[PDB]
């Protein structure tokens, strides 16, 4: 596409100094570029597409919440209209996302670190496609979730920060879209606990990401209990 | 809507 | 162009959506395609105009001078070429604010109210396209405020709302832009003073909207004495 | 860059 002359390596550092400018759309495209160059991505590099990508659909998400409690309440054609505008808007980022993971960062990423990454992402953006949503985009996200979740229990330990962020996220999967509120606190617990089992083999860098993303699980089961 | 907490950026 | 479809009345009801859902280009071309009908704006349509616009452009500059600011300390072309276009973009939208105005809210615009506003937001625009230029730039910008100024003067009262906002600017202008540090401070006092002089011939309501204003005048006279 | 105060949103 439009990034198709610059190269690799510019990509990556404009990509750097967008999300320094707090301009993640330009960010997004970047790592949009980078990634059709056709290379594997480092982890510093997965870390940039996924900050962009979450940062722009998280602006979709929030505006289309918005709109939609407007609508619910109101029930002329324009609230219906422009929550529809943000709507495909959104799933076209979701559909772009989607297509980047398939084409083809997941088939050629056979580390742990990486794949586990890029399912959760698979998980992340069927799971936003899903809020608006369905049956089949559900059963889409649990899927790779589900499939990132056995690669990471064989393969990383309970403390690795992308087992955490995955264990999180697939357990608000299961409290909000699969209206399995149970399995969410079963997953919270039980991925806290093993955890904290083993913060002891950790150095104190390595002890502050994990208790980060720990914190969080707690975060939703005091929400949730 | 009430949303618990996620993965990275708190973006929405 | 891309809203030559929609009604005025679904543009503005739509304009005031994406304000509500924080969707300021959404906003902007909204409010665009509505100037475009080629009626005149209301009160309440002008601020919808300038609350979108001034938020587009305010993300350009918060991110132009992040930029700008890595670009001076860096001194490859990458941080020049990205700084160069967040700085078309900039320009891009301050032409596409000053072509409205131009094609045709001034000409049209007879009541001080709205013929000052309009006059404001040209001198504002102009003044975003000095920060990143530029002689004529800044006269064209010095020569709106000026005769947004002199009708202020004879059309409106002191504390109005409209001409506070107005010298404000002026000021800001005069300290950043033009270099005259001593005209800023010397018309900021006496805003502010004429102002004062003027609150106890308004309403509670009246009182707060302009003492909100002259607060800003109070606020840049601290940081500039 | 320490910015001024002027009209409306404050935006950047
Ligand atoms: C974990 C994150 S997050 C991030 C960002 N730019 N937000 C960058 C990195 C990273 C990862 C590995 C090595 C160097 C940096
Ligand atoms: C962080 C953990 S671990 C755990 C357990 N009972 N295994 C419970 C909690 C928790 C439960 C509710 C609210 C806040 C925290
Ligand atoms: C002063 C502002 S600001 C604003 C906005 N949507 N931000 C709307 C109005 C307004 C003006 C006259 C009459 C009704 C409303
Ligand atoms: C608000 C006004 S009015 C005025 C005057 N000397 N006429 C001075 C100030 C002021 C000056 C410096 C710092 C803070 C406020
Ligand atoms: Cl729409
Ligand atoms: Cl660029
Ligand atoms: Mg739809
Ligand atoms: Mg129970
Ligand atoms: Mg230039
Ligand atoms: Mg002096």
Request: hydrophobic share 40%; proline share 3%; glycine share 4%.
């Given at each position: ?108 990423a056979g580390d742990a670190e990486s794949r586990v990454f890029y399912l959760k992402m698979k998980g992340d ?101 | ?12």
């Open positions: 596409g439009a990034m198709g002359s610059m190269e690799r390596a510019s990509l990556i550092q404009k990509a750097k100094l967008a999300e320094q400018a707090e301009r993640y759309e330009d960010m997004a495209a970047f790592m949009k570029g980078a990634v059709e160059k056709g290379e594997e991505l480092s982890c510093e590099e997965r870390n940039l597409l996924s900050v962009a990508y979450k940062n722009v659909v998280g602006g979709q998400r929030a505006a289309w919440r918005v709109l939609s409690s407007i609508e619910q309440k109101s029930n002329g054609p324009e609230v219906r209209e422009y929550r529809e505008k943000v709507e495909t808007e959104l799933q076209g980022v979701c559909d772009t996302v989607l297509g980047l993971l398939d084409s083809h960062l997941i088939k050629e953006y069927y799971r936003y496609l899903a809020e608006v949503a369905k049956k089949r985009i559900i059963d889409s996200a649990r899927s790779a979730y589900q499939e990132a979740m056995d690669i990471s229990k064989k393969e990383m330990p309970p403390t690795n920060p992308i087992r955490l962020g995955l264990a999180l996220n697939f357990s608000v999967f299961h409290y909000e879209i699969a209206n399995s509120p149970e399995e969410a606190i079963s997953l919270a617990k039980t991925t806290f606990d093993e955890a904290m089992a083993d913060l002891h083999t950790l150095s104190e860098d390595s002890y502050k990401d994990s208790t980060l993303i720990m914190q969080l699980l707690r975060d939703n089961l005091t929400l949730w209990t | 809507k009430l949303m618990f907490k996620t993965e990275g950026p708190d973006s929405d």
